[PDB]
């Protein structure tokens, strides 16, 4: 249906990506994701938001789900900005997925 739906459906089948919970509200289409292999796992939520209409991706790191030791390992491997909530244009979603995937494999 919506471009957003199409993008989500493909995102859920990316290598190394496991989508758990999905919802749609007024702001857009949101889903919880686990990414990464044995080396490291990161949980995060993506939002595909539409609000003359604007589209953006919201990235929310889910750190509460980690143990302290897992968080310490992740903080060595990933850039500081992946421990904060981010917005970025859809055209950067590929760059985001590649950065996350490479950072977890390091």
């Amino acid at each position: 249906a919506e471009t957003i739906e199409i993008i989500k459906d493909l995102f859920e089948h990316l290598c190394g990506v496991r989508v758990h919970r999905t919802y749609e509200d007024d702001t857009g289409l949101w889903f919880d994701t686990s990414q990464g292999s044995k080396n490291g796992i990161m949980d995060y939520k993506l939002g595909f938001v539409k609000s003359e209409v604007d589209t953006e991706v919201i990235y929310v790191p889910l750190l509460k789900q980690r143990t302290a030791e897992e968080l310490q390992e992740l903080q060595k491997k990933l850039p500081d900005y992946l421990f904060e909530t981010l917005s970025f244009p859809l055209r950067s979603l590929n760059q985001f997925y590649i950065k996350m995937s490479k950072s977890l494999n390091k």
Partner: peptide
């Protein structure tokens, strides 16, 4: 797709409001 909970609806708005914009991810 699925109907949102109160927490999910709150979370969406809080996360949109507090998000830091980044244009791209790359190293030179």
């Amino acid at each position: 797709s699925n109907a949102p909970t109160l927490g999910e609806r709150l979370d969406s708005l809080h996360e949109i409001k507090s998000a830091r914009r980044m244009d791209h991810f790359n190293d030179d």
